[PDB]
Every structure is written in structure tokens, then in C-alpha cells.
A paper describes a structure:
Here, we report that a critical glycine residue (Gly463) dominates the motion of threonyl-tRNA synthetase (ThrRS) and the sensitivity of the enzyme to antibiotics. The natural product Obafluorin (OB) is a potent inhibitor of bacterial threonyl-tRNA synthetase (ThrRS). Our previous work showed that OB covalently binds to ThrRS, forming an ester bond with a tyrosine residue in the catalytic center via the highly strained β-lactone ring, making OB the first covalent aaRS inhibitor with demonstrated crystal structures. The binding of OB induces a large conformational change in ThrRS.
In the apo state EcThrRS_G463S structure, the sidechain of the highly conserved residue Gln484 in the catalytic pocket forms a hydrogen bond with Tyr462, while in the OB-bound structure of the wild type (open state), the conformation of Gln484 is changed to accommodate OB. The distance between Ser463 and the conformation-altered Gln484 is only 1.6 Å. To test the possibility that Ser463 might become resistant to OB by blocking the conformational change of Gln484, we designed a G463S_Q484A mutant to remove the sidechain of Gln484 to avoid potential spatial conflicts. However, in the TSA experiment, OB increased the Tm of EcThrRS_G463S_Q484A by 17.2 °C, 10 °C less than the effect of 36j, suggesting that the EcThrRS_G463S_Q484A mutant, similar to EcThrRS_G463S, could still not be covalently inhibited by OB. Consistently, cocrystallizing 300 μM EcThrRS_G463S_Q484A protein with 600 μM OB did not yield an EcThrRS_G463S_Q484A–OB complex structure. The EcThrRS_G463S_Q484A structure is still in an apo state. Therefore, G463S endows ThrRS with resistance to OB neither by altering the protein’s structure nor by direct or indirect spatial repulsion.
Author numbering:
A (entry chain B), B (entry chain A): 242 to 642
The structure:
């Protein structure tokens, strides 16, 4: 159940010494990554977010103003051009404040939710790297909510709904929640931390979530709620984070015009459900042991043929299933039919369609799954509808499974 | 008509001094970018390309084995970690070969078409940076085809088909083709250079494409066909690129087992239709002067009420259209109906739905386009149905013109 072993077997990704801690996504692995984007983008529309894209490196003067430079200078990549030093972004927080700062905003623009699939780069030690779990180049499903102080409860409640909503799609139902409090090197007065810590504590209790206090483990700018999910091996994975930041928007001079026509600093809420999506794919690879659900499968259907008589019929089927929105390959190789079926069974292709002379003259197809489950002959349109339902619903279990 | 003024007016993007030549894509601009990605991915499916992803930095040693370091080392960014120098990738070619090298390849795996929306960073002088046309961080629609010598004539013909297929969607019909020959600073044998240059000219003749040679304007490793398009102002924009490479696969130790069971070095084709997608968005911005086709419009439909009586009926339509996959926004401000239409016309929204009490009872809408035309009262399901066809077909023309 090692993702590195399964990743090599299914041709999902690879890593090499020339880029330590950075992933070479192959076609099948990228399909999973992009399909996770589609699911996340589906939730961003449902929860009414904005998707933006910031630049990959910015001037060091920005990271000095946030205080990130004074704290994580060793963990950042630096580069220079025209006697100016730039940092490859390890976080999307300052980049989102820049977008919010363009054009005067009013209180009617809030709550303004801003998400991004930002690719970040942290200079982790090479000895600390392990597969997809600990990488240098990662992509966080970051988002920052700009809202007023009266809107904190409603925004955090929406974030908590999203944390459990997205985890339930993958089957993760056991979740442990912590609450990281102020550390010994922080910014912002005590009374700001007091109100921030109490805000997250109340929202956790109003959501009927039992939580423990991780004292001193919060970020230097905000206290955070940490969600830890458990896989089928009962292993704890810390993925979700929700923070309450009253300081960084002020340090970057973010302002909005309130109802009293007074300049006010907006509240910033950092949140990430999956965390590092590279790491989340590694968790899913081990959680399902390569048996990804149909909607996440790199190759959803393979249509083979027994002889060259059914070569035309398979091509007609591959075209039709593709137009229905199904990731389908056609295997017209010159091999034994038992050799083809085994290859795709090892590739964990959820469904494999076999076309003999009987299938062509009957207008049907024989279906077997990657589990050895044999479904027999089914009408072509019947199969298409069942795959469309299993993909739209993002169901975890297959047909007859 | 300058894309920077139109970009600021439509809230598409912005740039600042802290990131020279690097774009802050706002929400509406990023919607255009992603809609381009969807269109390109639709072409990748039709033309049967793979989509992969590579790391954003790699060891300087890898960039030295290709000669990329020798040619443009002043155009690269460099960063260091644990006494190892890494270069932020300005090209996606080395990353794809590393993916190709992983795993044993035979002749049966060719042609291997591998595409990527790679984020590149070139260290351009700040005096040359202009808007979106000249940037430091750009996203190319790169693709590399690994094929045998016999497959060259078909694979290059496939690229030429793709170039004219994609440009037809945007209405560009005046394409000017050049063939960049070898430069005086180059690598590879003369005999290899003549095979590649002659093959490109033959491929253009087979498609009945008039072209001129361009001496010395080719890459150090391959000759390339350069596609230049003309906008409605008759200005030449060089976007397309198809190169025939005999040099880099040999240098990066890429090989495939042939039919003779003897290892052979594959032929590489570098393909790029749109080029820099930030630059393409800028060209489209000036070509349409902000009147993006409905399939690219950040906000396709705006629904407005004449008074507070129609507030609820407007919201039902906003939800009904949103479920139909249309980018619909509701305008419920307390402003005269003429003021709303004038504002959203300046925002170049394709369609504007006005809802009076006559519309609430009849269940219909009043359609007004950004061109000042009036389409009268139409059934809501009829408006949705025709709007969907205009998007799925990526039609340049709007309704009733
Ligand atoms: Zn953040
Ligand atoms: Zn290339």
C-alpha cells in the first residue's frame, strides 16, 4: 500500500535527483490532479468563490513587510535580476492582498472570497523529502476570505461546512480537529489574539466539533483550526487548516470603505481543505491502494477486441463513449484477449469492455471490472448512462460492488 | 484599443513594480485564461495528445547537457539549494524527455504526443517589457512529439492541421508562414540540419501553403516553421511554432527499441499553437476590442430588475441560468434601468436581461446586447437553449446578427 510503489506501477508520476522534491506528473497522474481541480472548482462555484492567479516570484520587500522573510528565510528560494532580489512564492497570501488592493473596495464588496491553485516552493531539506508526502514544489488549494468583523462567524461556518463536505466525497469520515493558539514569536497585540482564538473556539463548538488545544502551534500571524483525517489504516493525516488573521492585511495596507464611509481594514481568513494536492493524491493512492473511484480514474474504460473482425466496432464504441464524457481507450493490439484484460486489470481500469463476434452482431458489449466482477452483456446505451451517473455523483463504489 | 486600457477597464489583470513582467490575473481575466485552457484541452483530446506536468526548476547540469545554458544563460533565472544550482525552466523540452526516459520505450509507443501548459520564466530586460505581450513569466501551450523518422511527414502534417483548426475559432484567417533556417550559432550536424529543413518545406508544400525562408532566425537546435497571424488592424503577430529536432533527444539519452530490436534515438517535434497564452489573451483583447465571443466572456449574462418587485424573479433566473452552465450575474442595485445597461455595456457583457412586471407574469425576459441591439421578449428556456449552443459551438457571432 505504498504510493511510491503504486505510483510507479500505474505510471502516475516519478521523481529524480535533478529536481529533488519536485514531481514529474505523467499523463495518468496529471489526469487525477486535473480531476481534483474540477471537483474543487465545482465547490468554488457552489460556495461562491473567485479563482485568481498570482505571479510566481515577487520582490523581497513584500516578504519583509509581512514578516515572512524574517521567519522563513531559510525555507524560501531566492533569485535575482537587475540588482533586485525576488522570492519564489511559498504562500499565496500576499499575492491575494495585491489583487484586493487594486481599485477601491467598499463594504458591499465583502465578503469577497478569493481562491487559487497556487504552486508554492519551500526549500525543505533534501533528507526530509519522501515521495509525494514531503515535496519542495506543491500546489495548495488556497483561499482567502475578505470580510468584516461582523461576518467572521458566518464565513468560518462556511469553511467548516466545506471541510467536511469535500472530505466526505473521498470517504474520510473520522476527523480529529485541533486549535493552534498563539506562538512565542508572533505579530499583533494580545487582545487581537484573544478575540481570534475565541472566535475559532466558538465556531467549533457551534458546529458540534470536539477539539483539543495545541498550545503555541499557530502561525505567527493568526491562530488556526487544524483538521486531521484518518485513512483505512487508521493513520492520521493533517490536511485542513482554517486561520483567522487580523494582522497581515494591515501590514499590506488593505482597506475598504465601510457603511459609515470610514476607512477600515478587512479581516482575512486563510483556508485550505486538501492542503498540498500532491500530498492528497498520495493519501488517496494509499487509501484506495490504486483502486481510484471511477470519476478519479485516469482511464475509466478500455474497449478491446478479440480478433480483427471487431476492429471497426470497437472504434465506433470508443468514439461514442468519448462523446459522452468518458475517458476511454481502445486496445486494438495484436495480442491474446486474455493478455489485454490482464494488463488493464493491473492498471486498475474500473471497466473493461470486450467485443467478440457475438457483441458486434447483437449491438451490445460484455463488461468486466478490475475486481474480477463479471457483468456480462449489456446494451451500449445502458452502460453509458451508468458511467455518467457514477461520474456525476462521484460515487466511491462501482456497479455490483 | 490598447489591451492594457481594456484590461484595466474590464478588471482582467494588473501588473506592478514588485513583479516586472509578471501578471496578476484577476478573476475575470483568469476566466478567459481557463476558457482558453478548456479549448486547448478539447483540441488535445481530438488530436490525441497527452497532458503532463513538469517541475518549475531543475538542475543546471541538465540544462548544460542540451546547450540551453550556452545559448541563453542571461535569459534564465537561477536559484541554489544545498550547494546545487537550479534554473527556473524557460522551456518544457528537457522536462518532457525526462518523462519519456522513465520506463522502457519501444517502437509501439510511438508516435508519443505529450503536451503541457508549462509555466516558464525568462529573464527579460525591464525596458523591453510591454503589457501582456512582453512578460517574464508566461504560460506556453507546449507540446512535444516523439516519433520515428518514417512518422515525420504525418506528425508535422498533424501540427499544421492543428494550427489552422485553432486559429479558425478566433476568426484569424490571414496566416503568414515563414521557415526559419539554421543560425550561425547552432549545434547538430549539417546533414541533420538539411534533413530537418527539407522536411519542413516538403510538409508545407504538401499542404499547399505559400511561405518564405527566414535565414538565421531558427533555434540553435532545430529549424522551425513560424506562423504569423494578422488581426483586424492588419498587424502581424507571430504565434505558431513547429520545429523538427534531431539534436536534444540524442543529448538527453532518449531511446526507443525499434522493430529490429536495436535501440534508436527518437525524433522530436516541438509544437506551440498560441505561444504565450498571456500574449494571446492580449492579442484577442485588441482584436475584439473587449467584445470577447460569448464562450470567452468573463460574464456572459447580466439580469437586472427595474424595481424591488422583480427582485425574487431575477434571482430565480440567475439560479436557473447558473445551473445551465452560463456565467450569469444579477444586478439588483437601486439605479435607473438605463444606467445599468450603460454600465454593463461598458463592461462588454454579451447579453443583458431586463425584467419588468410584464416579464414576471409572462415568464419571459427582455434581451439587450452589448451592441445596442434589442431582441425583444423571449421564453426563458428558449434564451437558455440558444445561449448554450452559442457557447458549445464557440460562435464568434452573437444572436440575431
Ligand atoms: Zn494563506
Ligand atoms: Zn520545445
Amino acid at each position: 500500500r505504498d504510493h511510491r510503489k503504486i505510483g510507479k506501477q500505474l505510471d502516475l508520476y516519478h521523481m529524480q535527483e535533478e529536481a529533488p522534491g519536485m514531481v514529474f506528473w505523467h499523463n495518468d497522474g496529471w489526469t487525477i490532479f486535473r480531476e481534483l481541480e474540477v471537483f474543487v472548482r465545482s465547490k468554488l462555484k457552489e460556495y461562491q468563490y473567485q479563482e485568481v492567479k498570482g505571479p510566481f516570484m515577487m520582490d523581497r520587500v513584500l516578504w519583509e513587510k509581512t514578516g515572512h522573510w524574517d521567519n522563513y528565510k531559510d525555507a524560501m528560494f531566492t533569485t535575482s535580476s537587475e540588482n533586485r532580489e525576488y522570492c519564489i512564492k511559498p504562500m499565496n497570501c500576499p499575492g491575494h492582498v495585491q489583487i484586493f488592493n487594486q481599485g477601491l473596495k467598499s463594504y458591499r464588496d465583502l465578503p469577497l472570497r478569493m481562491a487559487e491553485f497556487g504552486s508554492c516552493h519551500r526549500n525543505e531539506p533534501s533528507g526530509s523529502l519522501h515521495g509525494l508526502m514531503r515535496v519542495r514544489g506543491f500546489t495548495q488549494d488556497d483561499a482567502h476570505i475578505f470580510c468584516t468583523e461582523e461576518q467572521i462567524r458566518d464565513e468560518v461556518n462556511g469553511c467548516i461546512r466545506l471541510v467536511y463536505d469535500m472530505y466526505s466525497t473521498f470517504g474520510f469520515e473520522k476527523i480529529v480537529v485541533k486549535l493552534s493558539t498563539r506562538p512565542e514569536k508572533r505579530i499583533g497585540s494580545d487582545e487581537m489574539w484573544d478575540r481570534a482564538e475565541a472566535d475559532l473556539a466558538v465556531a467549533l463548538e457551534e458546529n458540534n466539533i470536539p477539539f483539543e488545544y495545541q498550545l503555541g502551534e499557530g502561525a505567527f500571524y493568526s491562530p488556526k483550526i487544524e483538521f486531521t483525517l484518518y485513512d483505512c489504516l487508521d493513520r492520521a493525516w493533517q490536511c485542513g487548516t482554517v486561520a483567522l488573521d487580523f494582522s497581515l492585511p494591515s501590514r499590506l495596507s488593505a482597506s475598504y470603505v465601510g457603511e459609515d464611509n470610514e476607512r477600515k481594514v478587512p479581516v482575512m481568513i486563510h483556508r485550505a481543505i486538501l492542503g498540498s494536492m500532491e500530498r492528497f493524491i498520495g493519501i488517496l493512492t494509499e487509501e484506495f491502494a490504486g483502486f481510484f473511484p471511477t470519476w478519479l480514474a485516469p482511464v475509466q474504460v478500455v474497449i478491446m477486441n478479440i480478433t480483427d473482425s471487431q476492429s471497426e466496432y470497437v472504434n465506433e464504441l470508443t468514439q461514442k463513449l468519448s462523446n459522452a464524457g468518458i475517458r476511454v481507450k481502445a486496445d486494438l493490439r495484436n495480442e491474446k484477449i486474455g493478455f489485454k484484460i490482464r494488463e488493464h486489470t493491473l492498471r486498475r481500469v474500473p471497466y473493461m469492455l470486450v467485443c467478440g463476434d457475438k457483441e458486434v452482431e447483437s449491438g451490445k458489449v460484455a463488461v468486466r471490472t478490475r475486481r474480477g466482477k463479471d457483468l456480462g452483456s449489456m446494451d451500449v446505451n445502458e452502460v453509458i448512462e451508468k458511467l455518467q451517473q457514477e461520474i456525476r455523483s462521484r460515487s466511491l463504489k462501482q456497479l455490483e460492488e
